[PDB]
Write a protein that binds this DNA or RNA. Structure first.
Ligand code: 8DG
Ligand code: CA
Ligand code: CA
Ligand code: NA
Length: 327
DNA sequence: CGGCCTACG
DNA sequence: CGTA
DNA sequence: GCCG
């Protein structure tokens, strides 16, 4: 078992679902307290279990697995012996956890805002609605649409949506393409939102594209909310339903074709996978990775990549298809 | 112990 | 601060 | 919280 999640295949479904879910609760709670370090360890431990070829049945099977120390091992031990971990259950029922989860789920609210609201004594969505003067325009949209945004987006909804985005994109710039990224590209059948990556095969033609796309989507009556030169837009879209519609979060991002492999890799995730890949790159290879490129700070040069395969090769890693990046 | 991904709106 |  |  290698130490970085980007060094091992992690499938979407696996053999340790209950154990991973418990560790991820502890990870999430650590994030609500501002401990990114402990959030990372619990996420990494969870991800290790996702990568195993069969169920963990005995405590001895954790010996020598990376990211399992005294704490994560005790969590697994208790689950194996009793079916339940007292620490996890205490977190699940804490007012702090439940409220921070509720608030951070709102589009436009992060941990810092949620925590301040918690310290002010606020606990429910109706508490936030009663004092609407304190909300940003983003948070008001987030609150208004919260019920719809809490319903999973189905993979079966995505194709019709991609088609409407493609029509707007084709008008904005003939020849521009739309690629489905995020969890759906990793094989998920649901998601909290839809992620699209837009480019054009002629380098430079994509400049100024996103505003043109957004204007056209807005003219079609499809945009319930968006922030408005730019290259990422975090929107709420109107998605057709039988006799009606629902609000759906959609991310649109533009990249030049030179950067497309880096953008595709970054936006395809998973979030832990990409953090681990970037850490691997810097710490093991001395190269700086982001969604735009891969930089050698000794030579002061960018790696040219024509594919995700190129990027894995330049980092000395075995290629993983998107379906095995579910860290 | 230091480090924990790296960007854009 | 929010967002990915 | 864990790794190196
Ligand atoms: N490097 C980096 N990438 C991120 C972060 N947050 C984040 O979502 N991403 C990337 C990895 C994700 O898989 C991708 C899309 O984000 P997402 O929140 O829509 O996640 P998803 O599609 O996997 O999940 P979901 O919609 O099924 O819930 O963007 C971050 O903080 N850093
Ligand atoms: Ca998504
Ligand atoms: Ca997204
Ligand atoms: Na939020």
């Amino acid at each position: 078992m290698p130490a970085y999640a980007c060094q091992r295949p992690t499938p979407l479904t696996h053999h340790n679902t209950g154990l991973s879910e418990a560790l991820e609760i502890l990870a999430e709670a650590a994030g609500f307290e501002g401990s990114e370090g402990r959030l990372l360890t619990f996420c990494r431990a969870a991800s290790v279990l996702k990568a195993l070829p069969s169920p963990v049945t005995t405590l001895s099977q954790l010996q020598g697995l990376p990211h399992f120390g005294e704490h994560s091992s005790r969590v697994v031990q208790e689950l194996l012996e009793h079916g339940v971990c007292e620490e996890v259950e205490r977190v699940r029922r804490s007012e702090r956890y439940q409220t921070m989860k509720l608030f951070t789920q709102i589009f436009g609210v992060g941990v810092k805002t949620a925590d301040r609201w918690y310290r002010e004594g606020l606990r429910t969505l109706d508490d936030l609605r009663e004092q609407p003067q304190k909300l940003t325009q983003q948070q008001k949209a987030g609150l208004q649409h919260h019920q719809d945004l809490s319903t999973p987006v189905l993979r079966s909804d995505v194709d019709a949506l991609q088609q409407v985005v493609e029509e707007a994109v084709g008008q904005a710039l003939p020849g521009a393409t739309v690629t489905l990224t995020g969890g759906f590209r990793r094989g998920k059948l649901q998601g909290h939102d839809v992620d699209f990556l837009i480019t054009h095969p002629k380098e430079g033609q994509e400049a100024g594209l996103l505003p043109r796309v957004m204007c056209r989507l807005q003219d079609q009556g499809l945009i319930l909310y968006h922030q408005h030169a730019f290259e990422r837009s975090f929107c709420i879209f109107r998605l057709p339903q039988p006799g009606s519609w629902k609000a759906v979060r959609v991310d649109l991002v533009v990249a030049p074709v030179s950067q497309f492999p880096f953008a595709l890799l970054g936006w395809t995730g998973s979030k832990l996978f990409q953090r681990e890949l970037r850490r691997f790159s810097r710490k093991e290879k001395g190269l700086w990775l982001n969604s735009h490129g891969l930089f050698d700070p000794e030579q002061k040069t960018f790696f040219q990549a024509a594919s995700e395969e190129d990027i894995f090769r330049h980092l000395g890693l075995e290629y993983l298809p998107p379906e095995q990046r579910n860290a």
